[PDB]
Amino acid sequence: TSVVIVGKISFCPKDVLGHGAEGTIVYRGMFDNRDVAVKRILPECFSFADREVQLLRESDEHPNVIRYFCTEKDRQFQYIAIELCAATLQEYVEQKDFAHLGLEPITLLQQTTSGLAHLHSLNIVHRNLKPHNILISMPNAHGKIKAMISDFGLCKKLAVGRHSFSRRSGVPGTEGWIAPEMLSEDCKENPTYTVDIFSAGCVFYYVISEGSHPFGKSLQRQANILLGACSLDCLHPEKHEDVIARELIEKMIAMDPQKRPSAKHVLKHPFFWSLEKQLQFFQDVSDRIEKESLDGPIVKQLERGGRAVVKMDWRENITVPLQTDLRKFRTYKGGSVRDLLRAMRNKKHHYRELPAEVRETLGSLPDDFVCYFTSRFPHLLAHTYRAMELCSHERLFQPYYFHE
Ligand SMILES: Cc1nn(C)cc1-c1cc(C(=O)Nc2c(Cl)ccc(NS(=O)(=O)c3ccccc3F)c2F)c2ncnc(N)c2c1
C-alpha cells in the first residue's frame, strides 16, 4: 500500500479522485513538493494524450484554462500532472451552501466564459463542456477561487478561416449537454464554435438553479434538446435578475446555432454587470437619446412594447416622495420608457441637492438607487439592452456590447 514514483511525480494509488475514459484514473499526488492531480493513461490512449498535451504546450496560457505541470512515462503507462483543484463544478454545485457565497457562483461562470473565449480565439472548439470537467481551484492568499476548463479529449483545432467542422468525426460529446446540431436527423449546416455556447448555456442554468438542467431530468435531456423542449422554471419572469439571466440563457441554448451569442458577446451581457455598471448603462442611454426625435428609429424602437415595461403609467408605480419631487419643474409621459429613463438620469445627476425624504426613498448611489427602479420595473434593463443594440457600434456603448 506504498507510494508509486515515476520521475518527479509521486502518488499513492489509494488517493483516487475519480475514474473515466475506460482505464484512465485520476489520483491525487505530488510533483516538485506541490499538491497535484495525476491522470494515468493506458497505451491505447498514448496517441490522443500526446495530441492534447502538444495542443496545450503550444497554445497561449490563460488563468481559466487548466495548465499541466509535467508529463511522465514508464514502460507501461503515461502520466499527466496538473494543479490540484478543490472540486469539479459539479461537486461544487451539489455540495456548497450557496447562501454564504454571494456572487462567487456568477464569477465562476464569468471565468468559464473567459476561458472559452480564449480557446475560441485560438481556433479551438472544446465540444465537451460540462460541470464535471470545469475545475474549481484551491483558494489563493485572499481566499478567492477560479474556474478552469479541462478535458480536451474531444476538442478540435480548426484551420484558419474555417468556420466549422464535420459532425461525423469523433464522439458527439456527453449526453444531456450536446448541441442539437450534433445529433439531429435533418441538419444542413455543420457544427461550429456555438456548440460550446449551447453547452455553456446549460451550465449557466445548472449553476444558478443549483442542479437543474434546461432540458429536464437526465433520461429526458437529449431527447428534449432535439425537440427544443427547454424549461427555465427557476427564473421568475418578474424578478429583474431572473429576467436578465433568462434573456442570456435562452439565447445561448437556442435551437438555431446562428442565434447563439459568441463567448465575447456573453462576456458583455448585463448578466455580469455590477449594480453601478447597470446604472451607468441607464445614464448613457438617457444621454444618447435626449436629443433624438421621438419619430427617429432609436426612440421608436425603444418605445415598442414599452407600455408593459413601464406598467402603463410608471408614475403610479414609484413611491410618493419621488412622485412629489418629479412635479417640481417639468412633466413626464407615464407610458414612455424614454421618460422613465429621463427621470432616473435627473435624480441621479441632481442627487446631492435632492430633498432628504427623496434621497431616503431612493437609497444611496449607486447600488440602492439603481435597484429602486429595477425592482419596480424588472423588464426595464432587459428591454433597454435589446432596444439599444442599434447603437452597439458607437464608441460610447463599447463597455456594454461586443462589436467589430
Ligand atoms: C474524474 C473526476 N471525478 N471526480 C468526482 C472528480 C474528478 C477530477 C478530475 C480531475 C482531472 O481530470 N484532472 C486532469 C488531469 Cl489530472 C490531467 C489532465 C486533464 N485534462 S486533459 O485534457 O487530459 C489535459 C491534457 C494535457 C494537459 C492538460 C490537460 F487538462 C484533467 F482534467 C481533477 N483534476 C484536478 N483536481 C481535481 N480535484 C480533479 C478531479
PDB file of all heavy atoms in Angstrom, residues 17-20 26-27 37-39 49 52-53 56 66-68 71 80-88 91 132-133 135 149-153, ligand 1:
ATOM      1  N   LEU A  17      -9.082  10.363  -7.038  1.00  0.00           N
ATOM      2  CA  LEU A  17     -10.041  11.452  -7.150  1.00  0.00           C
ATOM      3  C   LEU A  17     -11.199  11.114  -8.078  1.00  0.00           C
ATOM      4  O   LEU A  17     -12.289  11.674  -7.919  1.00  0.00           O
ATOM      5  CB  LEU A  17      -9.339  12.722  -7.642  1.00  0.00           C
ATOM      6  CG  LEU A  17      -8.241  13.282  -6.733  1.00  0.00           C
ATOM      7  CD1 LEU A  17      -7.383  14.274  -7.484  1.00  0.00           C
ATOM      8  CD2 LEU A  17      -8.839  13.932  -5.499  1.00  0.00           C
ATOM      9  N   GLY A  18     -10.992  10.209  -9.037  1.00  0.00           N
ATOM     10  CA  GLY A  18     -12.040   9.824  -9.965  1.00  0.00           C
ATOM     11  C   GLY A  18     -11.557   8.972 -11.122  1.00  0.00           C
ATOM     12  O   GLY A  18     -10.353   8.895 -11.382  1.00  0.00           O
ATOM     13  N   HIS A  19     -12.488   8.330 -11.827  1.00  0.00           N
ATOM     14  CA  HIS A  19     -12.204   7.461 -12.962  1.00  0.00           C
ATOM     15  C   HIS A  19     -12.722   8.097 -14.249  1.00  0.00           C
ATOM     16  O   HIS A  19     -13.274   9.198 -14.246  1.00  0.00           O
ATOM     17  CB  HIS A  19     -12.829   6.080 -12.749  1.00  0.00           C
ATOM     18  CG  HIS A  19     -12.256   5.327 -11.590  1.00  0.00           C
ATOM     19  ND1 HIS A  19     -11.494   4.189 -11.748  1.00  0.00           N
ATOM     20  CD2 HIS A  19     -12.329   5.549 -10.257  1.00  0.00           C
ATOM     21  CE1 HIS A  19     -11.124   3.741 -10.562  1.00  0.00           C
ATOM     22  NE2 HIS A  19     -11.617   4.548  -9.640  1.00  0.00           N
ATOM     23  N   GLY A  20     -12.545   7.392 -15.355  1.00  0.00           N
ATOM     24  CA  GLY A  20     -13.120   7.823 -16.616  1.00  0.00           C
ATOM     25  C   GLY A  20     -12.335   7.303 -17.801  1.00  0.00           C
ATOM     26  O   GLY A  20     -11.261   6.718 -17.670  1.00  0.00           O
ATOM     27  N   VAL A  26      -7.668   9.135 -12.163  1.00  0.00           N
ATOM     28  CA  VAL A  26      -7.084  10.386 -11.695  1.00  0.00           C
ATOM     29  C   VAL A  26      -6.805  10.243 -10.204  1.00  0.00           C
ATOM     30  O   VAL A  26      -7.732  10.164  -9.388  1.00  0.00           O
ATOM     31  CB  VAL A  26      -7.986  11.597 -11.982  1.00  0.00           C
ATOM     32  CG1 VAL A  26      -7.399  12.853 -11.352  1.00  0.00           C
ATOM     33  CG2 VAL A  26      -8.146  11.797 -13.476  1.00  0.00           C
ATOM     34  N   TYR A  27      -5.531  10.209  -9.849  1.00  0.00           N
ATOM     35  CA  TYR A  27      -5.103  10.150  -8.462  1.00  0.00           C
ATOM     36  C   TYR A  27      -4.682  11.532  -7.984  1.00  0.00           C
ATOM     37  O   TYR A  27      -4.382  12.426  -8.775  1.00  0.00           O
ATOM     38  CB  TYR A  27      -3.930   9.179  -8.279  1.00  0.00           C
ATOM     39  CG  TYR A  27      -4.078   7.824  -8.941  1.00  0.00           C
ATOM     40  CD1 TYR A  27      -3.661   7.622 -10.249  1.00  0.00           C
ATOM     41  CD2 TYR A  27      -4.601   6.739  -8.246  1.00  0.00           C
ATOM     42  CE1 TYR A  27      -3.775   6.383 -10.857  1.00  0.00           C
ATOM     43  CE2 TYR A  27      -4.720   5.496  -8.847  1.00  0.00           C
ATOM     44  CZ  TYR A  27      -4.304   5.326 -10.152  1.00  0.00           C
ATOM     45  OH  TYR A  27      -4.415   4.099 -10.768  1.00  0.00           O
ATOM     46  N   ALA A  37      -2.789  16.786  -9.241  1.00  0.00           N
ATOM     47  CA  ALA A  37      -3.593  15.654  -9.667  1.00  0.00           C
ATOM     48  C   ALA A  37      -2.873  14.958 -10.811  1.00  0.00           C
ATOM     49  O   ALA A  37      -2.238  15.611 -11.644  1.00  0.00           O
ATOM     50  CB  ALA A  37      -4.990  16.094 -10.103  1.00  0.00           C
ATOM     51  N   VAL A  38      -2.958  13.630 -10.839  1.00  0.00           N
ATOM     52  CA  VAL A  38      -2.229  12.824 -11.808  1.00  0.00           C
ATOM     53  C   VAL A  38      -3.221  11.946 -12.549  1.00  0.00           C
ATOM     54  O   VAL A  38      -3.962  11.181 -11.923  1.00  0.00           O
ATOM     55  CB  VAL A  38      -1.143  11.965 -11.142  1.00  0.00           C
ATOM     56  CG1 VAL A  38      -0.257  11.338 -12.200  1.00  0.00           C
ATOM     57  CG2 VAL A  38      -0.322  12.798 -10.173  1.00  0.00           C
ATOM     58  N   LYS A  39      -3.232  12.048 -13.873  1.00  0.00           N
ATOM     59  CA  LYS A  39      -4.057  11.196 -14.717  1.00  0.00           C
ATOM     60  C   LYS A  39      -3.182  10.103 -15.319  1.00  0.00           C
ATOM     61  O   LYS A  39      -2.144  10.396 -15.921  1.00  0.00           O
ATOM     62  CB  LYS A  39      -4.738  12.013 -15.817  1.00  0.00           C
ATOM     63  CG  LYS A  39      -5.937  11.329 -16.460  1.00  0.00           C
ATOM     64  CD  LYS A  39      -6.728  12.281 -17.358  1.00  0.00           C
ATOM     65  CE  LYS A  39      -6.438  12.037 -18.834  1.00  0.00           C
ATOM     66  NZ  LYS A  39      -7.383  12.782 -19.723  1.00  0.00           N
ATOM     67  N   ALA A  49      -3.326  11.373 -25.949  1.00  0.00           N
ATOM     68  CA  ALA A  49      -2.719  12.181 -24.897  1.00  0.00           C
ATOM     69  C   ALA A  49      -1.587  13.042 -25.441  1.00  0.00           C
ATOM     70  O   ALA A  49      -1.439  14.203 -25.040  1.00  0.00           O
ATOM     71  CB  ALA A  49      -2.216  11.288 -23.767  1.00  0.00           C
ATOM     72  N   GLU A  52      -3.186  16.096 -27.175  1.00  0.00           N
ATOM     73  CA  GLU A  52      -3.754  17.113 -26.294  1.00  0.00           C
ATOM     74  C   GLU A  52      -2.668  17.883 -25.547  1.00  0.00           C
ATOM     75  O   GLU A  52      -2.761  19.106 -25.406  1.00  0.00           O
ATOM     76  CB  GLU A  52      -4.720  16.473 -25.295  1.00  0.00           C
ATOM     77  CG  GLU A  52      -5.774  15.572 -25.913  1.00  0.00           C
ATOM     78  CD  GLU A  52      -6.411  14.642 -24.888  1.00  0.00           C
ATOM     79  OE1 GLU A  52      -6.932  15.147 -23.870  1.00  0.00           O
ATOM     80  OE2 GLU A  52      -6.374  13.405 -25.092  1.00  0.00           O
ATOM     81  N   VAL A  53      -1.645  17.182 -25.047  1.00  0.00           N
ATOM     82  CA  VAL A  53      -0.538  17.856 -24.372  1.00  0.00           C
ATOM     83  C   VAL A  53       0.173  18.797 -25.336  1.00  0.00           C
ATOM     84  O   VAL A  53       0.489  19.943 -24.991  1.00  0.00           O
ATOM     85  CB  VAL A  53       0.436  16.824 -23.768  1.00  0.00           C
ATOM     86  CG1 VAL A  53       1.716  17.505 -23.300  1.00  0.00           C
ATOM     87  CG2 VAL A  53      -0.220  16.086 -22.618  1.00  0.00           C
ATOM     88  N   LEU A  56      -1.858  22.018 -25.702  1.00  0.00           N
ATOM     89  CA  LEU A  56      -1.764  22.999 -24.625  1.00  0.00           C
ATOM     90  C   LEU A  56      -0.355  23.555 -24.473  1.00  0.00           C
ATOM     91  O   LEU A  56      -0.193  24.732 -24.128  1.00  0.00           O
ATOM     92  CB  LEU A  56      -2.230  22.388 -23.305  1.00  0.00           C
ATOM     93  CG  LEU A  56      -3.730  22.144 -23.191  1.00  0.00           C
ATOM     94  CD1 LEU A  56      -4.116  22.067 -21.736  1.00  0.00           C
ATOM     95  CD2 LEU A  56      -4.519  23.235 -23.892  1.00  0.00           C
ATOM     96  N   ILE A  66      -6.882  25.074 -17.780  1.00  0.00           N
ATOM     97  CA  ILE A  66      -6.048  24.323 -16.856  1.00  0.00           C
ATOM     98  C   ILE A  66      -4.660  24.139 -17.461  1.00  0.00           C
ATOM     99  O   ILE A  66      -4.507  23.861 -18.659  1.00  0.00           O
ATOM    100  CB  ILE A  66      -6.722  22.984 -16.506  1.00  0.00           C
ATOM    101  CG1 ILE A  66      -6.154  22.421 -15.205  1.00  0.00           C
ATOM    102  CG2 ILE A  66      -6.595  21.987 -17.641  1.00  0.00           C
ATOM    103  CD1 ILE A  66      -6.880  22.902 -13.963  1.00  0.00           C
ATOM    104  N   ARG A  67      -3.637  24.339 -16.640  1.00  0.00           N
ATOM    105  CA  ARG A  67      -2.245  24.269 -17.068  1.00  0.00           C
ATOM    106  C   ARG A  67      -1.611  23.000 -16.512  1.00  0.00           C
ATOM    107  O   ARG A  67      -1.684  22.746 -15.304  1.00  0.00           O
ATOM    108  CB  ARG A  67      -1.486  25.510 -16.595  1.00  0.00           C
ATOM    109  CG  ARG A  67      -0.010  25.313 -16.349  1.00  0.00           C
ATOM    110  CD  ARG A  67       0.514  26.405 -15.432  1.00  0.00           C
ATOM    111  NE  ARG A  67       1.744  26.010 -14.753  1.00  0.00           N
ATOM    112  CZ  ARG A  67       2.221  26.612 -13.667  1.00  0.00           C
ATOM    113  NH1 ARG A  67       1.564  27.636 -13.137  1.00  0.00           N
ATOM    114  NH2 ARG A  67       3.351  26.188 -13.111  1.00  0.00           N
ATOM    115  N   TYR A  68      -1.006  22.197 -17.384  1.00  0.00           N
ATOM    116  CA  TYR A  68      -0.344  20.996 -16.900  1.00  0.00           C
ATOM    117  C   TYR A  68       1.051  21.338 -16.394  1.00  0.00           C
ATOM    118  O   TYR A  68       1.699  22.276 -16.868  1.00  0.00           O
ATOM    119  CB  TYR A  68      -0.289  19.908 -17.981  1.00  0.00           C
ATOM    120  CG  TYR A  68       0.786  20.056 -19.031  1.00  0.00           C
ATOM    121  CD1 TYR A  68       1.998  19.385 -18.916  1.00  0.00           C
ATOM    122  CD2 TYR A  68       0.580  20.844 -20.150  1.00  0.00           C
ATOM    123  CE1 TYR A  68       2.983  19.511 -19.881  1.00  0.00           C
ATOM    124  CE2 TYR A  68       1.555  20.979 -21.118  1.00  0.00           C
ATOM    125  CZ  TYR A  68       2.752  20.312 -20.981  1.00  0.00           C
ATOM    126  OH  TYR A  68       3.715  20.454 -21.956  1.00  0.00           O
ATOM    127  N   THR A  71       4.578  15.857 -17.515  1.00  0.00           N
ATOM    128  CA  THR A  71       4.136  14.573 -18.043  1.00  0.00           C
ATOM    129  C   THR A  71       5.285  13.581 -17.944  1.00  0.00           C
ATOM    130  O   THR A  71       6.421  13.908 -18.301  1.00  0.00           O
ATOM    131  CB  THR A  71       3.670  14.678 -19.498  1.00  0.00           C
ATOM    132  OG1 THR A  71       4.765  15.089 -20.321  1.00  0.00           O
ATOM    133  CG2 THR A  71       2.534  15.678 -19.630  1.00  0.00           C
ATOM    134  N   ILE A  80      -0.039  12.441 -16.587  1.00  0.00           N
ATOM    135  CA  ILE A  80      -0.155  13.884 -16.748  1.00  0.00           C
ATOM    136  C   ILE A  80      -0.486  14.497 -15.396  1.00  0.00           C
ATOM    137  O   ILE A  80      -1.432  14.066 -14.728  1.00  0.00           O
ATOM    138  CB  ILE A  80      -1.228  14.270 -17.782  1.00  0.00           C
ATOM    139  CG1 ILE A  80      -0.977  13.555 -19.109  1.00  0.00           C
ATOM    140  CG2 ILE A  80      -1.243  15.783 -17.970  1.00  0.00           C
ATOM    141  CD1 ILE A  80      -1.948  13.945 -20.204  1.00  0.00           C
ATOM    142  N   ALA A  81       0.285  15.506 -15.000  1.00  0.00           N
ATOM    143  CA  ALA A  81       0.106  16.187 -13.727  1.00  0.00           C
ATOM    144  C   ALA A  81      -0.315  17.632 -13.967  1.00  0.00           C
ATOM    145  O   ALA A  81       0.353  18.367 -14.703  1.00  0.00           O
ATOM    146  CB  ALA A  81       1.387  16.140 -12.895  1.00  0.00           C
ATOM    147  N   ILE A  82      -1.431  18.026 -13.356  1.00  0.00           N
ATOM    148  CA  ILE A  82      -1.905  19.404 -13.355  1.00  0.00           C
ATOM    149  C   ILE A  82      -2.089  19.827 -11.903  1.00  0.00           C
ATOM    150  O   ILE A  82      -1.930  19.029 -10.981  1.00  0.00           O
ATOM    151  CB  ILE A  82      -3.212  19.575 -14.148  1.00  0.00           C
ATOM    152  CG1 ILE A  82      -4.393  19.085 -13.311  1.00  0.00           C
ATOM    153  CG2 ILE A  82      -3.134  18.814 -15.466  1.00  0.00           C
ATOM    154  CD1 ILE A  82      -5.728  19.152 -14.016  1.00  0.00           C
ATOM    155  N   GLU A  83      -2.426  21.099 -11.707  1.00  0.00           N
ATOM    156  CA  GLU A  83      -2.595  21.606 -10.353  1.00  0.00           C
ATOM    157  C   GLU A  83      -3.782  20.924  -9.682  1.00  0.00           C
ATOM    158  O   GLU A  83      -4.795  20.624 -10.323  1.00  0.00           O
ATOM    159  CB  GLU A  83      -2.781  23.125 -10.361  1.00  0.00           C
ATOM    160  CG  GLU A  83      -4.221  23.607 -10.406  1.00  0.00           C
ATOM    161  CD  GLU A  83      -4.343  25.121 -10.295  1.00  0.00           C
ATOM    162  OE1 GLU A  83      -3.507  25.836 -10.888  1.00  0.00           O
ATOM    163  OE2 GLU A  83      -5.273  25.597  -9.608  1.00  0.00           O
ATOM    164  N   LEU A  84      -3.640  20.640  -8.391  1.00  0.00           N
ATOM    165  CA  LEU A  84      -4.730  20.014  -7.660  1.00  0.00           C
ATOM    166  C   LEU A  84      -5.856  21.020  -7.463  1.00  0.00           C
ATOM    167  O   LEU A  84      -5.636  22.137  -6.986  1.00  0.00           O
ATOM    168  CB  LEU A  84      -4.243  19.479  -6.315  1.00  0.00           C
ATOM    169  CG  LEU A  84      -5.333  18.856  -5.443  1.00  0.00           C
ATOM    170  CD1 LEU A  84      -5.990  17.686  -6.155  1.00  0.00           C
ATOM    171  CD2 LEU A  84      -4.760  18.420  -4.113  1.00  0.00           C
ATOM    172  N   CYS A  85      -7.060  20.638  -7.849  1.00  0.00           N
ATOM    173  CA  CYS A  85      -8.203  21.514  -7.673  1.00  0.00           C
ATOM    174  C   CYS A  85      -9.071  21.021  -6.524  1.00  0.00           C
ATOM    175  O   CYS A  85      -9.038  19.849  -6.144  1.00  0.00           O
ATOM    176  CB  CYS A  85      -9.003  21.617  -8.970  1.00  0.00           C
ATOM    177  SG  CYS A  85      -8.045  22.399 -10.288  1.00  0.00           S
ATOM    178  N   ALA A  86      -9.835  21.952  -5.955  1.00  0.00           N
ATOM    179  CA  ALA A  86     -10.641  21.633  -4.785  1.00  0.00           C
ATOM    180  C   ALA A  86     -11.858  20.793  -5.147  1.00  0.00           C
ATOM    181  O   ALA A  86     -12.316  19.992  -4.325  1.00  0.00           O
ATOM    182  CB  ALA A  86     -11.066  22.921  -4.086  1.00  0.00           C
ATOM    183  N   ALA A  87     -12.384  20.946  -6.364  1.00  0.00           N
ATOM    184  CA  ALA A  87     -13.611  20.271  -6.780  1.00  0.00           C
ATOM    185  C   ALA A  87     -13.850  20.518  -8.261  1.00  0.00           C
ATOM    186  O   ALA A  87     -13.309  21.461  -8.848  1.00  0.00           O
ATOM    187  CB  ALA A  87     -14.829  20.751  -5.982  1.00  0.00           C
ATOM    188  N   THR A  88     -14.668  19.657  -8.853  1.00  0.00           N
ATOM    189  CA  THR A  88     -15.321  19.984 -10.109  1.00  0.00           C
ATOM    190  C   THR A  88     -16.486  20.931  -9.844  1.00  0.00           C
ATOM    191  O   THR A  88     -17.003  21.018  -8.727  1.00  0.00           O
ATOM    192  CB  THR A  88     -15.850  18.730 -10.803  1.00  0.00           C
ATOM    193  OG1 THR A  88     -16.884  18.153  -9.995  1.00  0.00           O
ATOM    194  CG2 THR A  88     -14.737  17.712 -10.995  1.00  0.00           C
ATOM    195  N   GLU A  91     -19.362  18.946  -8.256  1.00  0.00           N
ATOM    196  CA  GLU A  91     -19.298  18.747  -6.809  1.00  0.00           C
ATOM    197  C   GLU A  91     -19.548  20.051  -6.068  1.00  0.00           C
ATOM    198  O   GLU A  91     -20.148  20.058  -4.988  1.00  0.00           O
ATOM    199  CB  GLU A  91     -17.944  18.164  -6.413  1.00  0.00           C
ATOM    200  CG  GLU A  91     -17.643  16.815  -7.031  1.00  0.00           C
ATOM    201  CD  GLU A  91     -16.175  16.462  -6.932  1.00  0.00           C
ATOM    202  OE1 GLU A  91     -15.337  17.355  -7.150  1.00  0.00           O
ATOM    203  OE2 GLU A  91     -15.857  15.296  -6.626  1.00  0.00           O
ATOM    204  N   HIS A 132     -18.889  18.525 -14.928  1.00  0.00           N
ATOM    205  CA  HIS A 132     -17.961  17.535 -14.396  1.00  0.00           C
ATOM    206  C   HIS A 132     -16.505  17.822 -14.751  1.00  0.00           C
ATOM    207  O   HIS A 132     -15.615  17.350 -14.037  1.00  0.00           O
ATOM    208  CB  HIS A 132     -18.339  16.132 -14.874  1.00  0.00           C
ATOM    209  CG  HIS A 132     -17.407  15.057 -14.393  1.00  0.00           C
ATOM    210  ND1 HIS A 132     -16.657  14.283 -15.252  1.00  0.00           N
ATOM    211  CD2 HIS A 132     -17.108  14.627 -13.143  1.00  0.00           C
ATOM    212  CE1 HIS A 132     -15.941  13.418 -14.555  1.00  0.00           C
ATOM    213  NE2 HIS A 132     -16.192  13.609 -13.272  1.00  0.00           N
ATOM    214  N   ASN A 133     -16.223  18.573 -15.823  1.00  0.00           N
ATOM    215  CA  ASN A 133     -14.833  18.845 -16.190  1.00  0.00           C
ATOM    216  C   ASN A 133     -14.484  20.333 -16.160  1.00  0.00           C
ATOM    217  O   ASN A 133     -13.489  20.745 -16.762  1.00  0.00           O
ATOM    218  CB  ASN A 133     -14.491  18.244 -17.559  1.00  0.00           C
ATOM    219  CG  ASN A 133     -15.390  18.749 -18.677  1.00  0.00           C
ATOM    220  OD1 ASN A 133     -15.952  19.850 -18.608  1.00  0.00           O
ATOM    221  ND2 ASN A 133     -15.532  17.935 -19.720  1.00  0.00           N
ATOM    222  N   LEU A 135     -13.067  22.793 -13.522  1.00  0.00           N
ATOM    223  CA  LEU A 135     -12.390  22.614 -12.242  1.00  0.00           C
ATOM    224  C   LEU A 135     -12.407  23.903 -11.432  1.00  0.00           C
ATOM    225  O   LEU A 135     -12.311  25.002 -11.984  1.00  0.00           O
ATOM    226  CB  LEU A 135     -10.950  22.147 -12.455  1.00  0.00           C
ATOM    227  CG  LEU A 135     -10.836  20.851 -13.257  1.00  0.00           C
ATOM    228  CD1 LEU A 135      -9.402  20.357 -13.283  1.00  0.00           C
ATOM    229  CD2 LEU A 135     -11.756  19.787 -12.687  1.00  0.00           C
ATOM    230  N   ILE A 149     -11.106  25.462 -17.432  1.00  0.00           N
ATOM    231  CA  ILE A 149     -11.578  24.456 -18.371  1.00  0.00           C
ATOM    232  C   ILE A 149     -10.548  23.340 -18.476  1.00  0.00           C
ATOM    233  O   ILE A 149      -9.343  23.594 -18.587  1.00  0.00           O
ATOM    234  CB  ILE A 149     -11.863  25.105 -19.736  1.00  0.00           C
ATOM    235  CG1 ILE A 149     -13.104  25.997 -19.632  1.00  0.00           C
ATOM    236  CG2 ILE A 149     -12.021  24.046 -20.821  1.00  0.00           C
ATOM    237  CD1 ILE A 149     -13.404  26.775 -20.873  1.00  0.00           C
ATOM    238  N   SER A 150     -11.017  22.094 -18.430  1.00  0.00           N
ATOM    239  CA  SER A 150     -10.171  20.919 -18.582  1.00  0.00           C
ATOM    240  C   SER A 150     -10.811  19.961 -19.580  1.00  0.00           C
ATOM    241  O   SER A 150     -11.848  20.259 -20.181  1.00  0.00           O
ATOM    242  CB  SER A 150      -9.943  20.218 -17.237  1.00  0.00           C
ATOM    243  OG  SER A 150     -11.120  19.551 -16.817  1.00  0.00           O
ATOM    244  N   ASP A 151     -10.168  18.802 -19.753  1.00  0.00           N
ATOM    245  CA  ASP A 151     -10.671  17.692 -20.559  1.00  0.00           C
ATOM    246  C   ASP A 151     -10.811  18.066 -22.029  1.00  0.00           C
ATOM    247  O   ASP A 151     -11.918  18.326 -22.510  1.00  0.00           O
ATOM    248  CB  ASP A 151     -12.007  17.192 -20.000  1.00  0.00           C
ATOM    249  CG  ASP A 151     -12.463  15.897 -20.642  1.00  0.00           C
ATOM    250  OD1 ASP A 151     -11.794  15.417 -21.582  1.00  0.00           O
ATOM    251  OD2 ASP A 151     -13.496  15.353 -20.199  1.00  0.00           O
ATOM    252  N   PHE A 152      -9.697  18.059 -22.760  1.00  0.00           N
ATOM    253  CA  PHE A 152      -9.683  18.387 -24.179  1.00  0.00           C
ATOM    254  C   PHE A 152      -9.634  17.146 -25.062  1.00  0.00           C
ATOM    255  O   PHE A 152      -9.049  17.183 -26.150  1.00  0.00           O
ATOM    256  CB  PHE A 152      -8.508  19.311 -24.490  1.00  0.00           C
ATOM    257  CG  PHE A 152      -8.458  20.524 -23.618  1.00  0.00           C
ATOM    258  CD1 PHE A 152      -7.767  20.500 -22.421  1.00  0.00           C
ATOM    259  CD2 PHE A 152      -9.119  21.681 -23.981  1.00  0.00           C
ATOM    260  CE1 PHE A 152      -7.726  21.610 -21.611  1.00  0.00           C
ATOM    261  CE2 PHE A 152      -9.082  22.796 -23.172  1.00  0.00           C
ATOM    262  CZ  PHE A 152      -8.387  22.760 -21.986  1.00  0.00           C
ATOM    263  N   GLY A 153     -10.248  16.047 -24.617  1.00  0.00           N
ATOM    264  CA  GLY A 153     -10.219  14.822 -25.394  1.00  0.00           C
ATOM    265  C   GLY A 153     -10.986  14.903 -26.700  1.00  0.00           C
ATOM    266  O   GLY A 153     -10.643  14.214 -27.664  1.00  0.00           O
TER     267      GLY A 153
HETATM  268  C1  LIG B   1     -12.515  12.420 -12.731  1.00  0.00           C
HETATM  269  C2  LIG B   1     -13.092  13.089 -11.508  1.00  0.00           C
HETATM  270  N1  LIG B   1     -14.175  12.648 -10.933  1.00  0.00           N
HETATM  271  N2  LIG B   1     -14.459  13.457  -9.834  1.00  0.00           N
HETATM  272  C3  LIG B   1     -15.607  13.272  -8.943  1.00  0.00           C
HETATM  273  C4  LIG B   1     -13.504  14.416  -9.755  1.00  0.00           C
HETATM  274  C5  LIG B   1     -12.628  14.231 -10.789  1.00  0.00           C
HETATM  275  C6  LIG B   1     -11.414  15.080 -11.035  1.00  0.00           C
HETATM  276  C7  LIG B   1     -10.729  15.050 -12.255  1.00  0.00           C
HETATM  277  C8  LIG B   1      -9.597  15.815 -12.487  1.00  0.00           C
HETATM  278  C9  LIG B   1      -8.923  15.722 -13.799  1.00  0.00           C
HETATM  279  O1  LIG B   1      -9.457  15.113 -14.707  1.00  0.00           O
HETATM  280  N3  LIG B   1      -7.707  16.278 -13.969  1.00  0.00           N
HETATM  281  C10 LIG B   1      -6.987  16.215 -15.176  1.00  0.00           C
HETATM  282  C11 LIG B   1      -5.696  15.709 -15.130  1.00  0.00           C
HETATM  283 CL1  LIG B   1      -5.080  15.182 -13.593  1.00  0.00          CL
HETATM  284  C12 LIG B   1      -4.930  15.626 -16.277  1.00  0.00           C
HETATM  285  C13 LIG B   1      -5.456  16.052 -17.481  1.00  0.00           C
HETATM  286  C14 LIG B   1      -6.752  16.556 -17.545  1.00  0.00           C
HETATM  287  N4  LIG B   1      -7.314  17.008 -18.751  1.00  0.00           N
HETATM  288  S1  LIG B   1      -6.652  16.756 -20.254  1.00  0.00           S
HETATM  289  O2  LIG B   1      -7.495  17.452 -21.160  1.00  0.00           O
HETATM  290  O3  LIG B   1      -6.364  15.364 -20.360  1.00  0.00           O
HETATM  291  C15 LIG B   1      -5.110  17.600 -20.319  1.00  0.00           C
HETATM  292  C16 LIG B   1      -4.046  17.068 -21.016  1.00  0.00           C
HETATM  293  C17 LIG B   1      -2.848  17.752 -21.044  1.00  0.00           C
HETATM  294  C18 LIG B   1      -2.713  18.959 -20.382  1.00  0.00           C
HETATM  295  C19 LIG B   1      -3.779  19.484 -19.681  1.00  0.00           C
HETATM  296  C20 LIG B   1      -4.981  18.803 -19.656  1.00  0.00           C
HETATM  297  F1  LIG B   1      -6.038  19.303 -18.982  1.00  0.00           F
HETATM  298  C21 LIG B   1      -7.515  16.643 -16.386  1.00  0.00           C
HETATM  299  F2  LIG B   1      -8.770  17.139 -16.447  1.00  0.00           F
HETATM  300  C22 LIG B   1      -9.103  16.645 -11.452  1.00  0.00           C
HETATM  301  N5  LIG B   1      -8.011  17.405 -11.610  1.00  0.00           N
HETATM  302  C23 LIG B   1      -7.583  18.171 -10.629  1.00  0.00           C
HETATM  303  N6  LIG B   1      -8.174  18.232  -9.448  1.00  0.00           N
HETATM  304  C24 LIG B   1      -9.265  17.523  -9.191  1.00  0.00           C
HETATM  305  N7  LIG B   1      -9.867  17.605  -7.957  1.00  0.00           N
HETATM  306  C25 LIG B   1      -9.785  16.678 -10.209  1.00  0.00           C
HETATM  307  C26 LIG B   1     -10.931  15.894 -10.013  1.00  0.00           C
END
